[PDB]
C-alpha cells in the first residue's frame, strides 16, 4: 500500500516511503516483486536523494526472489550504507557470494597478468580489514589468514603477519600449510619468500624454514648470508646442524653453487661439512 | 496420523446410482409410459 | 565476546561452508560402492 | 495544522488551491511520525482518526474530479487503515459507501477474480443490512446467469451517491463485449436489432458505433464482415520436437548408469 | 482403593518397561546413525514420528502415577553424557534410577514443577553434540505439557518451554549441525509446537508474530538446502492466512515458493488441499477441482478421520459449480451422518430445476454452512442453477433450435436464452456454436483426430514418470 | 603404456598412503594381467614401509593369481 | 583448524569424482 506513496513525485515523501520499505521487507516479501522496476527507476536518477538506499532494498527483494547477482550488483551500488550494517544473517550471505565471486575472479586474473583484467570494487577488501578488525577483537588471526591465502593478495598477508605481536610460531604453522596443502608452485615461492623476509625481521632463524624454502627456491647466496650471520653472532650450534640437514636433503649442483658463495677455522669447518665427506665415513662406520 | 484438520468426522444399498439418474417420475411405468395409446 | 562475535563472523562462514561439502562426500560414497558392486557383477559374467 | 476538516466539504468544492492545501495536508500528516507500529496509545491514534478522515474527503474530492490512478491511491491507503493491526478505531460513518466505491470501481475494470476475493473480509454485512455494499453484489449476481436487462433497469435506482463515474465505465465495458460478440461472423441486421440488442431508439449512439465500430447502414441493412481466420495448418510441424523427445528417451536409457 | 487401588499396580510396570525401551532404542539408534552413516533419513526417526503423532500421545496424557511417566522427569533430570566416564557414569544412572522408579516413588512433580524438571535436563552438564537427544527428549515431554488440557497457567508454561526449545533450535541452526541435520526431526518439531502455539494465540491475541518469525524461519530454511524444511513451514505459513477471514489470498497468489518437490506422501496431500481452495476462490474451477481430486486420492489411509471428509466436502461444491456429481455417501460413517444430509440434499435440488427448495434448505442448513466456512455458495452457485441444464441439454442434443430450449429450460423467452447460451460458450461450458440466421444451436463435430494426433501427448509423461521410478530405484539401491 | 599408467600411481600419491588402497582396490581386479601387474607395484611404491595390513590384505590374492 | 578441514573436503570431493569416472568407463567397457 506504500507503493502508492512511491507513485507521487516529491522527495520528502520518498524517504518516508523507503524508510517503511526495509522495515517490513522481511514480512511483506512479494509485494515489492512487482514494484521492482519502480525502484530500479528511482535508482537511475542522479538527482535523487537516497538512491544508494534504493540499491539496499532492491538487494533485499532480489534476495527473496533468489536473484543473487541482482542483490550483488546492487550491493555494489549500495555504497557505505550496506557495510555499515554488519550484524545480520542477511549481510553475511551476500558477502559470502561476494568473496566467492572475487576469489574465482583473481584465480582467473592470475592467468592473465598482461593487462586485460577486470575493474574491481574496493569494499570487498573493506570487509577484509573489517574482518581483521574482528580478528583484532578476536586474538584469533587464523581465520583472516585463510582468505588471505585464497585471495591471492600478499601485502595483506604481510600486514597480518606484521600484526599486533602474537607469536612467530603462528606464521611457522602457516608455513606448514605451504608443505601440506599448497597446490600451485607459481605463487608458492612468493609466499615462501615473503616468509623469509619477516624471518630476517625476526630474531631467531628456524631449521624447517630453510629446510623447506631455500631448497624449493634454490638461492645459494641466501643461505650463505644467513649462516654467515650465524657465524657473526658466534652461533656454531645451529649452523653446524643445518649443514648436515642440507647435505642430507638438497641435491647436486646446489651444494656446488653455495660452496662458491662460501669464499665469496669456522670457514674451513663449513668447507668440510658442506662437502660432507665426514658424514659419509661415520655412516660407513655404522 | 492426525493432520489437525479432522475434528468433525436393499435399504439404500446401491441406491444413489438409481437415484442420480431417475428420481420420482411416476415409477409404476404404466399410467403414462404404457398409457400413451389413448392419444392415438 | 572475544570469540562469540567472531564465531558467528569468521567461523560461521567456514563451518556452514563445509556442511554441504560433507554432504556430497557422504553422498558419492553411497553412489560409488553401488557402482563398485555393479561392475563386480559384469566382471563375474565375462570372466566366467 | 488541523486544516479545514469541513472547509469546503458541504456546499461546493471548485477548488484547486485547497487541493494544494490537501496536498500540503498529506505533507503534514505523513511527515508527523509514522503509522506503521500502532501498538496502543489512543493519543497517537488521534491523528490516525484524522488521517482516515482526510483520505476519505480526499477520496470524495477524487471522484468529484474523476482521477483514475488517484482514486485507487487514496482507497488503498484507506484500506491500509482498515488493515490496522490494533484497530480500536471507532466506526467512521463513511466506510460502507467508501468500500462501495471500491467495490464498484474494481467491478468496472474487469477485476472479477479480485472481486470475489475482496468479499472475504465482509462477515455478515452483505445479508443483514448495508445497501451500499448490497447493491454491487446484487449487480454482480445479475451479471452471473443471463440477466443483462435487470442491470439496466436497476440503473435508475442507486440508494447511494450518484455512482455515475463508475457505472458509465461499467456499462461501456459491457456494451463493447456484446459488440465484441456481434463483431464476429454474425453478418447483417437492421437498426431495430441494434435497438433491441444494444439499446436506445435513435440517439447518436448509432453514430457512436458507426465510427468506433463498422456497421454502415446500406439499403436499410447493416454490414459486419467475417472475422473468421484461415487456420493455417500442416500438422507435421512437431517433426523436429518429436525427434527431440525420442533422443532423450535413449539418452535417459543409456549414459546414466 | 479395594476396587481401583488394587488395579493401580498393573498400569505402571509394563509401560515402565516397553514404553521406556521405546526411546532407549530410539535414542540409541538415532545416535548410531548420527555418528556413522550420517545420511540418517532411514531409521526409526520416521516410525517414532508416526508414534509421537499416534502412540505416545495416547500411551500417556497424565504422567501415569506409581512412576511410569511420573518417573521420567526425575530420571532425565541428571543427564551429562559428556566424556566417556561421564557417559559410563550416566549409564550407571540409567541403571540405578530406573531401578528406584521401578521399585519405589521418586520425585513426583505435581504438574507445575515440570519446568524446573526441564531446567536440570538443560543444565547438569548437558551437551551440544547430543543435539538429537536434547531436541527429542525436550519436545516429547511437551505433549504431556499441552495435552493435559487444563489450559490454565500452563499455557504460559507452554509458551516458555517451547521458546526454551526454540532457543536451542535456533542456536543449533547457528551452531553448525555437523553431519546430523536435525531439521529432519526439527521440521515436525516446529509443526507440533506451532499447532498448539497457534491454539495459544487463538486463546490470546493474533499469531502474526508467529508469521514474522516463520518468515525468518522459512528464510534460513532452503537457503541452507531443503530437507523437508520448505515443505513443512510453507503449509504452516499458509494456514494462518487462510484461517484469517481477511483478504489474504492474493498474498498467496504471489507466493512463489511452489516447490517442496517431495513430501513423503503426507505434506503434499494437504498442500494440494490448501491451494485447491485458493484457486477455487479466484473462480478458476477447472484446475481447482482436479488438484482437489488429486489431494483426495493421494493420502486417504486412515479410519474415518475427517479432513478426508473435508477435502470431500469442498470437492462436491466446485463440481456443482461445473455440473457433475458422483455418489458421495457410499462410505457412510457414524459422523458422516451429520455431514451427508445438507450436501446430498443440496445437489438434489441442483439437478432438478427447483429454486424454492434451494432457497429453503439454504435457510434450513445455513448454520451448518457457517461451521464449514462456505457461505459463498449462495452467491456463486445460483449461476450454475441455470447453467446445469444448458450443459445437460447441449450434451444430449446435437443441433437444437433456440425456440425449443426456452421451454426446456422453462425460461419462457427465446430472446434472452441466446444470451445464456452466449455466456456459457463465453465461459467454455460447452464448446458448441450458434447459427444466428434462422435460430440453430448446433453442437460440435464428430470424434476428432483423438485416435491419431493426441495420444503421444499423454504417452510422453508416462515414459518420463516410469523411467524416473527406474532411476529413483537404482540410485537408492545399495547401502551396503 | 597401460602399465606405466597404473605404475605411476605411487609416484603421485606416496605422501598420503591412505588413499592408495582405496583407489587400487579394483585396479587389482581387472581382466588383463598387465593392469593387475602395475596395480601390484603401485601398492609397493605408494606405501613405502608401513605395516598397512590393508594393502597386505590386497596382495594375498595377488600372489595367488593364475598368471605367473 | 577450520581452513585445513575445508581444504581436505575440497580434495576428497574432487578425488572420488575421479574414481567415480573410472567405474563409469569399466562398466561401459565390460558391456562390449
Amino acid at each position: 500500500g506504500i507503493i502508492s506513496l512511491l507513485d507521487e513525485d516529491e522527495p520528502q515523501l520518498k524517504e518516508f516511503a523507503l524508510h517503511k520499505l526495509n522495515a517490513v521487507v522481511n514480512d511483506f516479501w512479494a509485494e515489492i516483486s512487482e514494484s521492482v522496476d519502480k525502484i530500479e527507476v528511482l535508482y537511475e536518477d542522479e538527482g535523487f536523494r537516497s538512491r544508494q538506499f534504493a540499491a539496499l532494498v532492491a538487494s533485499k527483494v532480489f534476495y527473496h526472489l533468489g536473484a543473487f547477482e541482482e542483490s550483488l550488483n546492487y550491493a555494489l551500488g549500495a555504497g557505505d550504507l550496506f557495510n555499515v550494517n554488519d550484524n545480520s544473517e542477511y549481510v553475511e550471505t551476500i558477502i559470502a557470494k561476494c568473496i566467492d565471486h572475487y576469489t574465482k575472479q583473481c584465480v582467473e586474473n592470475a592467468d592473465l597478468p598482461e593487462g586485460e583484467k577486470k575493474p574491481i570494487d574496493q569494499r570487498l577488501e573493506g570487509i577484509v580489514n573489517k574482518m581483521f578488525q574482528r580478528c583484532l577483537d578476536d586474538h584469533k588471526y587464523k581465520q583472516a589468514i585463510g582468505i588471505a591465502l585464497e585471495t591471492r593478495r600478499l601485502d595483506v598477508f604481510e600486514k597480518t603477519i606484521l600484526e599486533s605481536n602474537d607469536v612467530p610460531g603462528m606464521l611457522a604453522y602457516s608455513l606448514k600449510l605451504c608443505m601440506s596443502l599448497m597446490q600451485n608452485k607459481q605463487f608458492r615461492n612468493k609466499v615462501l619468500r615473503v616468509l623469509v623476509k619477516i624471518y630476517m625481521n625476526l630474531e631467531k632463524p628456524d631449521f624447517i624454514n630453510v629446510c623447506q624454502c631455500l631448497i624449493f627456491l634454490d638461492d645459494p647466496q641466501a643461505v650463505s648470508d644467513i649462516l654467515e650471520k650465524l657465524v657473526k653472532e658466534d652461533n656454531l650450534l645451529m649452523a653446524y646442524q643445518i649443514c648436515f640437514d642440507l647435505y642430507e636433503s638438497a641435491s647436486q649442483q646446489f651444494l656446488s653453487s653455495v660452496i662458491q658463495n662460501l669464499r665469496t677455522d669456522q670457514t674451513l669447518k663449513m668447507i668440510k661439512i658442506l662437502s660432507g665427506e665426514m658424514a659419509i665415513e661415520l655412516h660407513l662406520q655404522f | 496420523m492426525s493432520e489437525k484438520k479432522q475434528p468433525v468426522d436393499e435399504d439404500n444399498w446401491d441406491d444413489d446410482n438409481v437415484e442420480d439418474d431417475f428420481s420420482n417420475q411416476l415409477r409404476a411405468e404404466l399410467e403414462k409410459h404404457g398409457y400413451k395409446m389413448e392419444t392415438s | 565476546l572475544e570469540e562469540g562475535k567472531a564465531g558467528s563472523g569468521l567461523r560461521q562462514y567456514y563451518l556452514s561452508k563445509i556442511e554441504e561439502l560433507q554432504l556430497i562426500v557422504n553422498d558419492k560414497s553411497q553412489n560409488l560402492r553401488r557402482l563398485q558392486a555393479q561392475r563386480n557383477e559384469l566382471n563375474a559374467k565375462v570372466r566366467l | 495544522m488541523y486544516e479545514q476538516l469541513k472547509g469546503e466539504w458541504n456546499r461546493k468544492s471548485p477548488n484547486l488551491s485547497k487541493c494544494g492545501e490537501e496536498l500540503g495536508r498529506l505533507k503534514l500528516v505523513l511527515l508527523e511520525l509514522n503509522f506503521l507500529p500502532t501498538t496502543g496509545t489512543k493519543l497517537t491514534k488521534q491523528q490516525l482518526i484524522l488521517a482516515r478522515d482526510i483520505l476519505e474527503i480526499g477520496a470524495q474530492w477524487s471522484i468529484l474530479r474523476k482521477d483514475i490512478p488517484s482514486f485507487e491511491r487514496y482507497m488503498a491507503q484507506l484500506k491500509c487503515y482498515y488493515f490496522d493491526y490494533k484497530e480500536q478505531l471507532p466506526e467512521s460513518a463513511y466506510m460502507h459507501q467508501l468500500l462501495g466505491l471500491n467495490l464498484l470501481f474494481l467491478l468496472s475494470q474487469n477485476r472479477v477474480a479480485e472481486f470475489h476475493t475482496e468479499l472475504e473480509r465482509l462477515p455478515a454485512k452483505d445479508i443483514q443490512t448495508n445497501v451500499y455494499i448490497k447493491h454491487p453484489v446484487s449487480l454482480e449476481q445479475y451479471l452471473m446467469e443471463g440477466s443483462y436487462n435487470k442491470v439496466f433497469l436497476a440503473k435508475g435506482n442507486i440508494p447511494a451517491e450518484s455512482y455515475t463515474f463508475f457505472i458509465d465505465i461499467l456499462l461501456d465495458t459491457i456494451r463493447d463485449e456484446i459488440a465484441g460478440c456481434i463483431e464476429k461472423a454474425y453478418e447483417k441486421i437492421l437498426f431495430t436489432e441494434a435497438t433491441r440488442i444494444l439499446f436506445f431508439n435513435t440517439p447518436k449512439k448509432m453514430t457512436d458505433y458507426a465510427k468506433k465500430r463498422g456497421w454502415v447502414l446500406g439499403p436499410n441493412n447493416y454490414y459486419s464482415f467475417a472475422s473468421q481466420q484461415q487456420k493455417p495448418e500442416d500438422t507435421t510441424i512437431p517433426s523436429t520436437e518429436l525427434a527431440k523427445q525420442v533422443i532423450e528417451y535413449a539418452r535417459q536409457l543409456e549414459m546414466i548408469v | 482403593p479395594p476396587g481401583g487401588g488394587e488395579q493401580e499396580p498393573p498400569p505402571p510396570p509394563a509401560p515402565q518397561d516397553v514404553e521406556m525401551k521405546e526411546e532407549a532404542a530410539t535414542g540409541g539408534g538415532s545416535t548410531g546413525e548420527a555418528d556413522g552413516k550420517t545420511a540418517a533419513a532411514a531409521a526409526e526417526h520416521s516410525q517414532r514420528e508416526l508414534d509421537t503423532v499416534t502412540l505416545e500421545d495416547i500411551k500417556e496424557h497424565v504422567k501415569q502415577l506409581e512412576k511410569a511417566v511420573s518417573g521420567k522427569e526425575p530420571r532425565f533430570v541428571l543427564r551429562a553424557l559428556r566424556m566417556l566416564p561421564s557417559t559410563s557414569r550416566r549409564l550407571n544412572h540409567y541403571v540405578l534410577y530406573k531401578a528406584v522408579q521401578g521399585f519405589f516413588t521418586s520425585n513426583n512433580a505435581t504438574r507445575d514443577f515440570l519446568l524446573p524438571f526441564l531446567e536440570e535436563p538443560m543444565d547438569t552438564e548437558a551437551d551440544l553434540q547430543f543435539r538429537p537427544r536434547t531436541g527429542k527428549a525436550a519436545s516429547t515431554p511437551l505433549l504431556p505439557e499441552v495435552e493435559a488440557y487444563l489450559q490454565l497457567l500452563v499455557v504460559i508454561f507452554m509458551m516458555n518451554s517451547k521458546r526454551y526449545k526454540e532457543a536451542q533450535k535456533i542456536s543449533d541452526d547457528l551452531m553448525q549441525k555437523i553431519s546430523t541435520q536435525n531439521r529432519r526431526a526439527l521440521d515436525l518439531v516446529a509443526a507440533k509446537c506451532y499447532y498448539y502455539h497457534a491454539r495459544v494465540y487463538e486463546f490470546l491475541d493474533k499469531l502474526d508474530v508467529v508469521r514474522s518469525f516463520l518468515h525468518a524461519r522459512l528464510r534460513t530454511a532452503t537457503l541452507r538446502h531443503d530437507a523437508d524444511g520448505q515443505a513443512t513451514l510453507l503449509n504452516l505459513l499458509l494456514r494462518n492466512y487462510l484461517h484469517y477471514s481477511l483478504y489474504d489470498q492474493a498474498e498467496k497468489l504471489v507466493s512463489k515458493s511452489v516447490f517442496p518437490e517431495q513430501a513423503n506422501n503426507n505434506e503434499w496431500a494437504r498442500y494440494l488441499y490448501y491451494t485447491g481452495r485458493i484457486k477455487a476462490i479466484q473462480l478458476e474451477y477447472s484446475e481447482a477441482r482436479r488438484t482437489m481430486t488429486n489431494a483426495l486420492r493421494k493420502a486417504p489411509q486412515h479410519t474415518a478421520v475427517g479432513f478426508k471428509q473435508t477435502v470431500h466436502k469442498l470437492l462436491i461444491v466446485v463440481e456443482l459449480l461445473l455440473g457433475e456429481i458422483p455418489d458421495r455417501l457410499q462410505f457412510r460413517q457414524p459422523s458422516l451422518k451429520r455431514s451427508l444430509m445438507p450436501y446430498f440434499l443440496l445437489t438434489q435440488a441442483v439437478r432438478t430445476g427447483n429454486l424454492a427448495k434451494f432457497n429453503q434448505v439454504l435457510d434450513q442448513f445455513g448454520e451448518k454452512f457457517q461451521a464449514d466456512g462456505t457461505y459463498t455458495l449462495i452467491i456463486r452457485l445460483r449461476h450454475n442453477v441455470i447453467k446445469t441444464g444448458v450443459r445437460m441439454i447441449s450434451l444430449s442434443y446435437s443441433r437444437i433450435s433456440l425456440a425449443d430450449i426456452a421451454q426446456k429450460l422453462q425460461l419462457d423467452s427465446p430472446e434472452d436464452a441466446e444470451f445464456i447460451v452466449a455466456k456459457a460458450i463465453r465461459d467454455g461450458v460447452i464448446e458448441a456454436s450458434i447459427n444466428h440466421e434462422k435460430g440453430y444451436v448446433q453442437s460440435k463435430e464428430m470424434i476428432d483426430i483423438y485416435s491419431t494426433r493426441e495420444p503421444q501427448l499423454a504417452f510422453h509423461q508416462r515414459i518420463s514418470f516410469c523411467l524416473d521410478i527406474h532411476n529413483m530405484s537404482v540410485k537408492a539401491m545399495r547401502f551396503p | 603404456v597401460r602399465r606405466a599408467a597404473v605404475e605411476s600411481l605411487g609416484f603421485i600419491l606416496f605422501r598420503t598412503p591412505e588413499q592408495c588402497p582405496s583407489v587400487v582396490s579394483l585396479l587389482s581386479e581387472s581382466y588383463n594381467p598387465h593392469v593387475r601387474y602395475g596395480a601390484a607395484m603401485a601398492l609397493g611404491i605408494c606405501c613405502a614401509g608401513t605395516g598397512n595390513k590393508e594393502a597386505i590384505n590386497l596382495l594375498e590374492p595377488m600372489t595367488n593369481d593364475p598368471v605367473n | 583448524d577450520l581452513y585445513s578441514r575445508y581444504k581436505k573436503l575440497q580434495q576428497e570431493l574432487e578425488f572420488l569424482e575421479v574414481q567415480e569416472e573410472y567405474i563409469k568407463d569399466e562398466q561401459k567397457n565390460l558391456k562390449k
Side-chain angles (χ1 to χ4, degrees), chain E residues 85-101:
Chain E
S86 295
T87 59
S88 65
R89 289 180 182 177
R90 292 295 182 272
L91 287 174
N92 292 319
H93 295 94
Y94 288 117
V95 171
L96 293 174
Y97 290 101
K98 298 184 191 178
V100 172
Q101 296 173 359

Side-chain angles (χ1 to χ4, degrees), chain D:
Chain D
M1 188 175 179
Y2 294 99
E3 295 292 326
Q4 292 89 22
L5 186 63
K6 294 183 290 295
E8 292 292 328
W9 177 70
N10 53 2
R11 183 178 182 271
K12 285 179 72 68
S13 294
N15 291 318
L16 294 174
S17 178
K18 190 175 285 293
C19 300
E21 181 67 29
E22 182 67 29
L23 184 64
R25 182 64 178 171
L26 296 174
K27 298 296 183 183
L28 289 176
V29 175
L30 290 175
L31 276 71
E32 290 176 353
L33 182 63
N34 202 359
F35 63 95
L36 181 63
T38 315
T39 301
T41 311
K42 182 69 175 178
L43 292 175
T44 196
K45 293 181 183 291
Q46 293 297 321
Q47 67 268 16
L48 295 175
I49 305 301
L50 274 73
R52 294 183 297 114
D53 291 332
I54 63 169
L55 292 178
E56 287 176 354
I57 194 171
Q60 294 296 323
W61 291 352
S62 299
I63 192 57
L64 192 146
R65 71 186 70 189
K66 188 177 66 67
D67 198 1
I68 302 299
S70 296
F71 180 73
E72 63 184 2
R73 180 178 68 188
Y74 290 105
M75 189 65 206
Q77 297 177 358
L78 284 163
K79 187 174 73 176
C80 285
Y81 289 166
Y82 297 108
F83 187 65
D84 197 1
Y85 301 96
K86 279 78 179 173
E87 186 177 1
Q88 296 299 110
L89 274 300
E91 193 271 336
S92 66
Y94 294 159
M95 180 185 70
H96 299 92
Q97 68 268 24
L98 181 65
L99 271 70
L101 294 172
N102 195 4
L103 194 67
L104 192 66
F105 175 74
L106 193 145
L107 199 157
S108 298
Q109 288 180 353
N110 202 0
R111 297 291 185 270
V112 64
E114 296 292 326
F115 184 80
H116 296 280
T117 187
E118 194 274 337
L119 296 173
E120 182 68 29
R121 70 169 68 92
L122 296 173
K125 300 294 287 184
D126 297 333
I127 303 299
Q128 297 295 110
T129 177
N130 195 1
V131 74
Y132 297 103
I133 297 294
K134 185 176 72 176
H135 184 273
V137 300
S138 178
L139 184 65
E140 184 69 25
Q141 187 178 1
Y142 292 158
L143 268 73
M144 287 295 108
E145 291 90 8
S147 185
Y148 291 105
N149 291 318
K150 183 69 176 177
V151 169
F152 294 93
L153 291 175
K155 189 194 292 181
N157 193 1
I158 296 98
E161 68 273 14
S162 178
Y163 284 172
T164 308
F165 297 102
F166 303 109
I167 67 172
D168 289 333
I169 301 170
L170 191 149
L171 299 174
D172 195 5
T173 193
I174 287 173
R175 296 290 178 87
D176 58 356
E177 182 177 2
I178 281 91
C181 184
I182 204 71
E183 287 296 329
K184 301 285 102 175
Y186 304 160
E187 295 293 324
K188 64 182 179 66
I189 39 93
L190 201 141
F191 174 74
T192 184
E193 284 84 1
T195 305
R196 290 182 183 91
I197 284 92
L198 288 176
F199 278 152
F200 285 118
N201 52 356
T202 305
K204 298 295 186 292
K205 192 184 74 175
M206 65 175 287
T207 305
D208 193 5
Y209 292 101
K211 275 77 178 176
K212 182 178 184 292
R213 297 292 92 194
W215 297 102
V216 176
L217 182 61
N220 200 4
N221 192 2
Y222 283 160
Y223 295 99
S224 180
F225 63 94
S227 67
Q228 184 64 41
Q229 69 271 16
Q230 291 84 17
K231 190 179 182 293
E233 60 90 19
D234 183 73
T235 64
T236 66
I237 300 169
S239 64
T240 61
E241 66 181 2
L242 290 174
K244 296 294 188 294
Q245 290 175 356
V246 184
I247 288 172
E248 76 251 8
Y249 291 171
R251 183 179 175 90
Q252 289 171 353
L253 290 168
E254 296 293 327
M255 196 198 79
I256 175 168
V257 182

Side-chain angles (χ1 to χ4, degrees), chain A residues 240 244 247 269 272-273 275-283:
Chain A
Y240 181 75
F244 287 167
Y247 184 73
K269 179 180 172 68
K272 294 184 286 185
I273 63 177
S275 66
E277 293 292 327
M278 62 179 73
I280 301 299
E281 293 103 17
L282 61 85
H283 172 70

Side-chain angles (χ1 to χ4, degrees), chain E residues 440-480:
Chain E
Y440 290 160
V441 180
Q442 65 182 358
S443 66
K444 61 181 72 176
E445 201 180 1
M446 199 183 173
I447 294 98
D448 291 331
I449 205 66
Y450 179 77
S451 67
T452 302
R453 181 61 60 198
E454 180 64 31
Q456 62 180 355
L457 294 175
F459 289 161
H460 183 274
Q461 292 84 15
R462 272 67 166 270
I463 285 291
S464 68
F465 183 73
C466 291
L467 63 88
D468 285 335
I469 297 170
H470 182 273
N471 287 319
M472 292 300 107
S473 67
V474 170
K475 294 296 289 184
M477 184 177 177
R478 178 65 64 191
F479 294 99

Side-chain angles (χ1 to χ4, degrees), chain A residues 196 200 210 214 217 219-227 258 261:
Chain A
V196 302
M200 294 302 109
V210 61
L214 188 140
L217 188 61
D219 293 331
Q221 71 272 14
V223 65
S224 71
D225 286 330
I226 66 170
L227 202 151
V258 63
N261 296 117

